[PDB]
């Protein structure tokens, strides 16, 4: 049985049988390609970096985000290790242009981040600082221990359990507030009353009903 | 009209030394990372962080 409207199936059977999109391409936990292009172009514009040196900065930013997370509240600068020297890049263009969130933007880097963590662990103990904060006691799960990791159908069940437990531990019982303090400050009404030299006082025009005795 | 340049200048000065504008000292703002918004002619935009706003 197919869904039918006015005596006609509302689905195209042939196209549907041929429709095989990638699961990560149609999920709403990852920024759309248009949003990613907008963010990338905005960061290029803000950094004043050409299209040839930009991927190196992207590599550095991906490694930094593996280490330190992708929270909306991150600020200051991030750092690239140019040999033995430290280069500082402002974080404002990275965060203010990431829509809907920076985590959704960095989700595009999740497979590369996992591969990079595995590669680094091939040569030395390399657990991302996110996994050190989460107190993950398994070193073989280091490849999933970052906060912008995207769970897919190929993620191992144990890795999925570990990632969900880490997310639950990190989020705790945080409750979102829709509003801050309202920007309308004035609560009183403007005083439009005149003030002349005939007034008995700055606040009273006269003392009309007053009786001396 | 000077708000973006003022914010950039405050960040630049804070890169070399503790620099909180006297407005933020009068307001008793206890966060140094928010010094870049602690002046009275700062213009809030769609790119201003929620915490800064």
């Amino acid at each position: 049985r197919m869904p039918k409207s006015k005596g006609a199936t509302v689905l195209n059977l042939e196209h549907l049988l041929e429709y095989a999109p990638q699961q990560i391409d149609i999920s709403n936990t990852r920024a759309t390609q248009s949003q990613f292009d907008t963010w990338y172009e905005a960061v290029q514009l803000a950094y004043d970096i050409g299209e040839t040196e930009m991927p190196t900065v992207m590599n550095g930013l991906m490694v930094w985000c593996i280490e330190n997370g992708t929270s909306p509240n991150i600020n200051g600068v991030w750092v690239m290790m140019c040999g033995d020297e430290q280069v500082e890049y402002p974080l404002k263009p990275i965060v203010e242009n990431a829509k809907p969130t920076l985590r959704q933007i960095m989700a595009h880097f999740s497979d590369v981040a996992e591969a990079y963590i595995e590669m680094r662990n091939k040569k030395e103990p390399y657990m991302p600082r996110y996994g050190l904060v989460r107190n993950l006691r398994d070193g073989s799960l280091a490849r999933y221990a970052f906060d912008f990791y995207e769970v897919t159908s190929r993620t191992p069940v144990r890795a999925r359990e570990a990632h969900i437990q880490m997310k639950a531990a990190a989020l705790k019982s945080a409750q979102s507030r829709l509003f801050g303090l309202d920007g309308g400050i004035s609560t009183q009404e403007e005083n439009t009353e005149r003030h002349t030299t005939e007034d008995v006082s700055p606040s009273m025009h006269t003392l009309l009903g007053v009786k001396n005795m | 009209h000077f708000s973006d340049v003022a914010e950039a200048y405050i960040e630049m000065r804070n890169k070399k030394e503790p620099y909180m504008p006297r407005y933020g000292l009068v307001r008793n703002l206890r966060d140094g990372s928010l010094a870049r918004y602690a002046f009275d002619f700062y213009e809030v935009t769609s790119r201003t962080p929620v915490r800064a706003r």
């Binding site: 514009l45 803000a46 950094y47 004043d48 970096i49 040196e53 190196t56 900065v57 550095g60 690239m80 140019c82 280069v87 500082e88 890049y89 402002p90 | 973006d4 340049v5 950039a8 200048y9 960040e11 630049m12 890169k15």
Partner: peptide, 11 residues
């Protein structure tokens, strides 16, 4: 890698 200026003309 190039260094980013504090107050640039892009702003």
């Amino acid at each position: 890698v190039p260094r980013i200026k504090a107050i640039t003309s892009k702003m």
